[PDB]
Amino acid sequence: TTTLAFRFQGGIIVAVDSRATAGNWVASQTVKKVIEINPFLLGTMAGGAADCQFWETWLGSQCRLHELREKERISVAAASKILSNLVYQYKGAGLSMGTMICGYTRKEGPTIYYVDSDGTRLKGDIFCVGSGQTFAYGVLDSNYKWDLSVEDALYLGKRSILAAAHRDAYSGGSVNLYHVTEDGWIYHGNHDVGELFWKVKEEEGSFNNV
Amino acid sequence: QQPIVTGTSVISMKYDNGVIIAADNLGSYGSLLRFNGVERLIPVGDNTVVGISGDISDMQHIERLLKDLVTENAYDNPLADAEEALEPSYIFEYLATVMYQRRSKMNPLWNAIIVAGVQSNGDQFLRYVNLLGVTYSSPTLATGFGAHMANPLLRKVVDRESDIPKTTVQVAEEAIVNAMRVLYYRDARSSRNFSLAIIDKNTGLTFKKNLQVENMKWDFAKDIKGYGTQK
Amino acid sequence: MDIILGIRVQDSVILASSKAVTRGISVLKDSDDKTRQLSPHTLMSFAGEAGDTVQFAEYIQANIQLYSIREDYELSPQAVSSFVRQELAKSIRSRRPYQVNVLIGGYDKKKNKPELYQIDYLGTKVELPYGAHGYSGFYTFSLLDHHYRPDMTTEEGLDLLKLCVQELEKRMPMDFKGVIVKIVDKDGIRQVD
Amino acid sequence: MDIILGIRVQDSVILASSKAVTRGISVLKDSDDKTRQLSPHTLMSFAGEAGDTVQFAEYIQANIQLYSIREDYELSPQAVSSFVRQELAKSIRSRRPYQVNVLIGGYDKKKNKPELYQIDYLGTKVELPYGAHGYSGFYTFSLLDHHYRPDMTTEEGLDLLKLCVQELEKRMPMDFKGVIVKIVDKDGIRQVD
Amino acid sequence: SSINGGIVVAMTGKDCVAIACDLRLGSQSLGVSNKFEKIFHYGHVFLGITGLATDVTTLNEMFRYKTNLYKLKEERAIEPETFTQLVSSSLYERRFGPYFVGPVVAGINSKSGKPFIAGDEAKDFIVSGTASDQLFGMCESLYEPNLEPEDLFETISQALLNAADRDALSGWGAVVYIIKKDEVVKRYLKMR
Amino acid sequence: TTIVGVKFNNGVVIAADTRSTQGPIVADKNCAKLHRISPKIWCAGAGTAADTEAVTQLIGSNIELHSLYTSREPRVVSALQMLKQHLFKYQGHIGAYLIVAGVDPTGSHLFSIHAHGSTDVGYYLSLGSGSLAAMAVLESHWKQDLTKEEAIKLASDAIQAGIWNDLGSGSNVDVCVMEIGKDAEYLRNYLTPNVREEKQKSYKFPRGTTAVLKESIVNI
Amino acid sequence: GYDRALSIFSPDGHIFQVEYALEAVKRGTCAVGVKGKNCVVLGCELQDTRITPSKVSKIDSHVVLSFSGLNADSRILIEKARVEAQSHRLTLEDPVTVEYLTRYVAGVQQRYTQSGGVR
Amino acid sequence: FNPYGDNGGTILGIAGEDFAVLAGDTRNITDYSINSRYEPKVFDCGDNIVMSANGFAADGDALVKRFKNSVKWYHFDHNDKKLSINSAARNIQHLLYGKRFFPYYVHTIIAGLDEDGKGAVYSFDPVGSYEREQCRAGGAAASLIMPFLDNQVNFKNQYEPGTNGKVKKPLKYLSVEEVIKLVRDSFTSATERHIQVGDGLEILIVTKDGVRKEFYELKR
Amino acid sequence: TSIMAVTFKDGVILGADSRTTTGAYIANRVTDKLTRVHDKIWCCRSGSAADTQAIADIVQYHLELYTSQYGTPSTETAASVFKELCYENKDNLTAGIIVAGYDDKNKGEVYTIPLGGSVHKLPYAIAGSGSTFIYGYCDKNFRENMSKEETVDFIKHSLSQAIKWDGSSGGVIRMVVLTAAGVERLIFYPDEYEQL
Amino acid sequence: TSIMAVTFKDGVILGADSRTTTGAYIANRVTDKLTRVHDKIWCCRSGSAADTQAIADIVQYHLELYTSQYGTPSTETAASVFKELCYENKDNLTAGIIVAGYDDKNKGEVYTIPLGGSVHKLPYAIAGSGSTFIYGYCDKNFRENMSKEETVDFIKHSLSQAIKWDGSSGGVIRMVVLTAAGVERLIFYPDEYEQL
């Protein structure tokens, strides 16, 4: 699997693959690895699917209770700490989680927190997670800019997932793109990695080995 | 956690008007054929028999539970001999519940159980549960070593549910008795002494004790010499 | 692994902590601050298991802040290091120990003295002129044992730290992405290069 | 671990190999050349278990030199890589396998073509436009897959190698102390920066 | 074996055989190459080998050796049945310390013209490698006896492509050989 | 796998199922498991197929050479002795479990051999995953005075019990009949009880559904 | 434990113990607050002045509590409020709002009007 | 003590535009033995929801029992309001994850109609992650079944014959009868090639008209 | 397995059950465990069937060689050959052999070769899994120089108890009687010995 | 250990050897293994001495309570209490108990509680390591309604063989005789029973 998020002037891009595997068997090509926590928060499933999906939906419930109590949007820092504290309370029980909590608030701006099963809680500009993370970093670090256009940032996300899909057998199926804005996240659709691969291979001329 | 004294196979079969279940009378202690009078068919009322294989101490615990269940069912129930008697399906569901709960507490009753009976509507009941809580029904059921040897023979009689109305009690009992003989030939933990129970929707429970495997064939052994070349 | 280093000089404590965070195959971050301010004149740096370190340090920070609010007073670096030692010594006997090694640098404004305490995850506390955890001491203590002087100024302390870091960068096989340097003195806590 | 990288461009093969040698806790050396010239137009780089790599590479070098003396002729890079593959494939079945991964860069002066062969310790041989062993490919292949062009000049190849090395230095947690770069072309083997 | 991945399928048709393989070379999850053809031929006999790529190469080189010596001694190219026996004996010679491979033989006997496949002489289809069970499902659904070569090509190609799409470790293109006593056509397929 | 042997009044029958499995997958629906050691000496193997094939081939070769050397028809006891000693040498690492049956100048014979080299004689035998079902049939229907036709019926019934009741067994019944003073009668697919029903539709694709990048002729 | 219903409704629907707690407040020493545009001012009218400090207690560096009534009860509320402020700052990433803290303290008081065995 | 076993069995959910199909083989196995030829694994849970929990059959039975009880309780506390398939999926997730640390060792599929009236299939891992899918196979022969359905339902890898791979073969409406035919052929091939795939195929069909049951005999 | 050999006035009788088991499955209910290695030298095998068959074949071969070179082997010589095989291969071979034989000078002799390959000459021997249950009975009931009939009864009773109690023992009771008169094979069926 | 209980015409006799071993060392050569839990209810202990002593003390306590509340317990009731302890603690406790008792209505009864905590009412029971060697002898020699003297002889012979063959058994033979007349303890020394 491959998931990435990066900050830019337009906010945050989230890009993920949709492959799921069981050994060599491709169990599904169409898994949603982004969890829509609420209209303003996204989480990325890269650990065990069940742990991420269950606990980030519960996190959405806690965000809603906080909003009802406090009359305000919860901070991304607060949401990520709620999740990381929960996950740390189950440390050693065998949770399997590796998620970017992505959001954009007025007080914080566009914010990403990496959260791990081990209880790591890192803020950062760029994170790639999953078996394809090194390939995605390779594209993204080569091409990232803060002043990048929204369309260029979406293309860069898609191309980093494509690079992982080419090289990592456990990544692929399709690319799901999200754009987090202050007004909330925007889904930028699903892109089949084979169509995308042969498109980029002709248009960009890359993958000359294939 | 580990079975100590064990019963071996229970075998059973639907027939047109009822169910037959048989089990041998042996408690083995590893390879020692230690206890030879262990009844493993527990009648519950006149409509149900519970055949138990595996650990005899857990079997005795289940038999206690079944007697208690009959006593409790009689409480404040003036129809406990009538339309509110225990059915085979009630006894099975209770046992399967206990077995699965015990499994889920990692403290299994180390048994395989067949509940044979006739429902008040006259339907044959024949269902298996084991120490895992795995349940299934078939026109023939056998536990343990009987699953590998008796089921083929009984299925040659009742291969599908449409064979049940064609199968008389005489044919079914003969098949069960022959299967017991085959088990005595081939199961090193079997006894020639067995119990058999018939549950008929008309003639009720018939419980036959102290049956013996008979008409064994051994005389061909005289001709067997050495292991290859010894004349 | 992480590098945390401390030097107590005449007027101040210098803490130096590595910026890298590594998960599995990749350097995720090159800018991580492995310290928490416990009080205006007390700083703790930490190293150890992922998650444990920050959970522990934030629990300590909250407790010291609560004490300060309740008493309207700042605990000595001695009292803080005793409290942290007690929490670590408990954790060894707990159902899941905090695998966390700390340095506590503080300036005691009653004594007008800098103090540096090293506490391992066992709760082994020792006051030291300079200190390190894990392999950082294996490369740095011979430089400190050779060059350290108790009357060093802050600037001499920083130059000695630079020599220690250069030696680590030469001989230690990991790339720790440099150090953040904090100074604790009578004016409080500041970050330096 | 060691980094070995190779890029076959239009006119030449570029091999890049990390300079570090690490034993246990310490970087012993920062200048190690992980290559042997097998013939005037064939170069092999190697990575793997300590001792095995150099023993293997020197045995290969001696055998190719013996062939060249016996025939007064230079084996093609194809024939060399087949021979090396056969030796590695034997070793898997031997009582102690050479744990050695190699890249063979050569210039075939009969074809006037550069050739780059990757051979793993199993004896899995593959001719490739660019190649890597271990984790170096995990970080570099997306750059090469994106930017590589078969008609690249040597200078474009070297710039792409620089990008790959910078990416390794950023994201790979070890400090490999940079790379030595060798170029194999029609003029033979030279070392570059 | 699975370290490298890969699949081979062969099918018989009406006076024809097809043999097809994926082109991926992996190192566990890392894809190394898409030029690693798994199908070799020795005269008119075709051998597909799945499994450990070092053993694939070693066995191809060994069978080249043996079939060249066969042609030199016998003064004729080896037939598919004889080659199947040769493969069997050569692999069992390493019964202890095996080659970790799945061979698939395909060809047409020069004298009788009978199509032959083995992996035996299971005449309908033969399947090997990581996606073997997907391939069994596809072929057992799609296969029909006595397909003409063009329909055989479509059938084997769809079996390979759809099975490969559900195997993580195989793909990045496929090759299909359609073999007739007079003519062999190689075709490359795109994968998506 | 289900294999059985049944002696009868003037001969011996061996029979087998034809399913070969790779784990839970049917690799071959019609594998021939009855292997000729010699014209009137036949074997059938459970366990790993390759070991059965190889040991049968080696022993058959040596039996043929020994028959030529002695100018005599081979004996079932020789095949037995050679198998026994080979398997004992390999200490059970050759995973061959065999029923060996045949006719020779000394009469009819039926033996089992286990991978460790242990042998026994029998009037009826079964081996493999279906051996318990087959033996249940044999124990319930075998008799000392079997005719040829009764023995063929009994053997195929025992294989059928394996086919219906053991997952590892299926498809067809193969039979070989070795009467004294007669050619061995091999009956490949003596029963075919497992013929697949016709599919609900043809799945023949129209020509051109598959996208082809490029074509080339191969020289051969 | 002791669970007696001490706060209960009278027939006229009053809770006498809460009214008498208000009488305790009314007997207690004054507190005054005046909010301006940019500050809030809190005031109050052989003792050792050093160790009889201001009745105005910080709950956190940004928020301040004064009280009237039973001093000992107020110490309990103040300690709970301080602990909650530090807890919010720990488990979430921000200091408490003044209204959050007020709501917490009012909740503590309310709960002690509806809980067995407590005044 | 191992609290788990494998009982085999294979299940297949397909969502149509106005229907859903949930199919399962009826064989219960233990190792190489048949326990039952007709032990149905696919259940109508009410509210036109069908469910199957393939894997360890005791945990599958327990999960189905608990889901049916959740449906009953939902009716009790919602005035017999119909449970939505989406709400059933969320509830099943909560049932499964409540056992996160001693999981129900089953792959669950539920099928039904969404509130638009379109076919819906949801699939669940043992721990309770779930996804709405067009189709899902589960159990032993899923790898034998689904690629063929991908090919025949979604026309995967099929291109328009004259276009030389430029144009996809266009998706089109399959009737429930066409889907049933494809399901039957897929299970027949899995019966041919997988030893666990049963003696019978039971199909539950959900439509606006309710749940209907079809049964087809498989081999053995 | 339950095996006996008993010396008596005229010679020695070997007895065995006929059950071979693989786990709880009876792989062979009519096994012949009484193996001739020489005309009047026989063995009872217990333990690994492959090991004991291989050993018995090798002993028969060595004793055939001995016979053709040096004349008739004594029972002690056969026991010595068994010993050398069992002892030199004690790590690989799990073989508990009873060797029994007759000659006109020594009469009947019995040798037991337990695991480890010690040899013990005894007036009677019991071995196998079922022998455990009859040690007391045999010690209480054996006496020297029984008649043939008394010895056959003694073996039949002992093995009937060993079969009653040991699941690994059963089937028929086979006996071989070795005397001056010759070699006689006996068989007793369950409906005879289960009445005892 | 070798323990017996045998019902007879007048009641029941319990028998035991006196050897306690720790490995091959005899830690106690004069052990009393016959434990009174009630006036005419006794048990023979085999297996873990700590477990069986703890169980017997708990049973004696429960039966003293039973006696004071409900009157005299039956031997079946004692066996049931033993069962409940052995069964509910079967994982921790390695206890094979023989329970024997007399009452005027049931006469002598014997119950064996093997490992696992099944209960078996029997006319006689044998247990312990040395019982293995005497299964055949006891089956051949037990008969219902023996006299006291015949029963004492039967136990003495059986245990003498169990001592002969089992290294873990030996010392004195202790017996307790339970009848209407009372409780009688017997002891037999090696120079008596080794002559048998």
Curated annotation (Swiss-Prot), chain B:
Record SUPFAM superfamilies: N-terminal nucleophile aminohydrolases (Ntn hydrolases)
Keywords recorded for this protein, A-Z: Cytoplasm, Nucleus, Proteasome
Gene3D superfamilies to which the protein is assigned, alphabetical: Glutamine Phosphoribosylpyrophosphate, subunit 1, domain 1
Domain of life assignment: Eukaryota
UniProt xrefs under InterPro entries: Ntn_hydrolases_N, Proteasome_beta4, Proteasome_bsu_CS, Proteasome_sua/b, Proteasome_suB-type
The keyword Nucleus is annotated on this UniProt entry: yes
Transmembrane segments: none
Listed Pfam families: Proteasome
GO biological process, alphabetically ordered: proteasomal ubiquitin-independent protein catabolic process; proteasome assembly; proteasome-mediated ubiquitin-dependent protein catabolic process
Entry's localization field: Cytoplasm; Nucleus
GO cellular component assignments: cytosol; nucleus; proteasome complex; proteasome core complex, beta-subunit complex; proteasome storage granule
Entry annotated with the keyword Cytoplasm: yes
Its biological purpose: Non-catalytic component of the proteasome which degrades poly-ubiquitinated proteins in the cytoplasm and in the nucleus. It is essential for the regulated turnover of proteins and for the removal of misfolded proteins. The proteasome is a multicatalytic proteinase complex that is characterized by its ability to cleave peptides with Arg, Phe, Tyr, Leu, and Glu adjacent to the leaving group at neutral or slightly basic pH. It has an ATP-dependent proteolytic activity. PRE3 and PRE4 are necessary for the peptidyl-glutamyl-peptide-hydrolyzing activity.
Similarity-based family: Belongs to the peptidase T1B family.
Further details from the record: Present with 16900 molecules/cell in log phase SD medium.
Record protein name field: Proteasome subunit beta type-7
UniProtKB/Swiss-Prot annotation, chains C, D:
A GO cellular component annotation in the UniProt record: cytosol
GO terms for biological process, alphabetical: proteasomal ubiquitin-independent protein catabolic process; proteasome-mediated ubiquitin-dependent protein catabolic process
Other facts: Present with 21800 molecules/cell in log phase SD medium.
Species of provenance: Saccharomyces cerevisiae (strain ATCC 204508 / S288c) (Baker's yeast)
Pfam families recorded: Proteasome (PF00227)
Gene3D superfamilies per UniProt: Glutamine Phosphoribosylpyrophosphate, subunit 1, domain 1
Primary role: Non-catalytic component of the proteasome which degrades poly-ubiquitinated proteins in the cytoplasm and in the nucleus. It is essential for the regulated turnover of proteins and for the removal of misfolded proteins. The proteasome is a multicatalytic proteinase complex that is characterized by its ability to cleave peptides with Arg, Phe, Tyr, Leu, and Glu adjacent to the leaving group at neutral or slightly basic pH. It has an ATP-dependent proteolytic activity. This subunit has a chymotrypsin-like activity.
Gene behind this protein: PRE1
InterPro entries in alphabetical order: Ntn_hydrolases_N (IPR029055), Proteasome_beta2 (IPR035206), Proteasome_bsu_CS (IPR016050), Proteasome_sua/b (IPR001353), Proteasome_suB-type (IPR023333)
GO molecular function ontology, one term from the record: endopeptidase activator activity
Matching PANTHER family: METALLOPROTEASE TLDD (PTHR32194), PROTEASOME SUBUNIT BETA TYPE-1 (PTHR32194:SF2)
Stated name of the protein: Proteasome subunit beta type-4
Residue positions where N-acetylmethionine is found in the record: 1
Assigned protein family: Belongs to the peptidase T1B family.
Swiss-Prot record, chain E:
Record location of the Glycyl lysine isopeptide (Lys-Gly) (interchain with G-Cter in ubiquitin) cross-link: 66
Location in the cell: Cytoplasm; Nucleus
Modified residues (Phosphoserine): 27
InterPro entries: Ntn_hydrolases_N, Proteasome_beta_3, Proteasome_bsu_CS, Proteasome_sua/b, Proteasome_suB-type
GO BP field: proteasomal ubiquitin-independent protein catabolic process; proteasome-mediated ubiquitin-dependent protein catabolic process
UniProt keyword terms in alphabetical order: Cytoplasm, Isopeptide bond, Nucleus, Phosphoprotein, Proteasome, Ubl conjugation
Domain of life: Eukaryota
An MF annotation (GO) of this entry: endopeptidase activator activity
GO cellular component: cytosol; nucleus; proteasome complex; proteasome core complex, beta-subunit complex
Functional note: Non-catalytic component of the proteasome which degrades poly-ubiquitinated proteins in the cytoplasm and in the nucleus. It is essential for the regulated turnover of proteins and for the removal of misfolded proteins. The proteasome is a multicatalytic proteinase complex that is characterized by its ability to cleave peptides with Arg, Phe, Tyr, Leu, and Glu adjacent to the leaving group at neutral or slightly basic pH. It has an ATP-dependent proteolytic activity. This subunit may participate in the trypsin-like activity of the enzyme complex.
Similarity comment: Belongs to the peptidase T1B family.
Name assigned to this protein: Proteasome subunit beta type-3
Organism: Saccharomyces cerevisiae (strain ATCC 204508 / S288c) (Baker's yeast)
Lineage: Eukaryota, Fungi, Dikarya, Ascomycota, Saccharomycotina
Gene it is expressed from: PUP3
Curated annotation (Swiss-Prot), chain H:
Keywords: Cytoplasm, Nucleus, Proteasome
InterPro entries linked to this entry: Ntn_hydrolases_N, Proteasome_bsu_CS, Proteasome_sua/b, Proteasome_suB-type
Family, similarity comment: Belongs to the peptidase T1B family.
Location of this chain's protein in the cell: Cytoplasm; Nucleus
Protein's recorded name: Proteasome subunit beta type-6
Primary residence: cytoplasm
Keyword Oxidoreductase: no
Disulfide-bonded cysteines: none
Record GO cellular component, one term: nucleus
Coiled coil: none
Domain of life: Eukaryota
Alphabetized CDD domains for the sequence: proteasome_beta_type_1
Assembly information from the UniProt record: The 26S proteasome consists of a 20S proteasome core and two 19S regulatory subunits. The 20S proteasome core is composed of 28 subunits that are arranged in four stacked rings, resulting in a barrel-shaped structure. The two end rings are each formed by seven alpha subunits, and the two central rings are each formed by seven beta subunits. The catalytic chamber with the active sites is on the inside of the barrel.
Family annotation (Pfam families): Proteasome (PF00227)
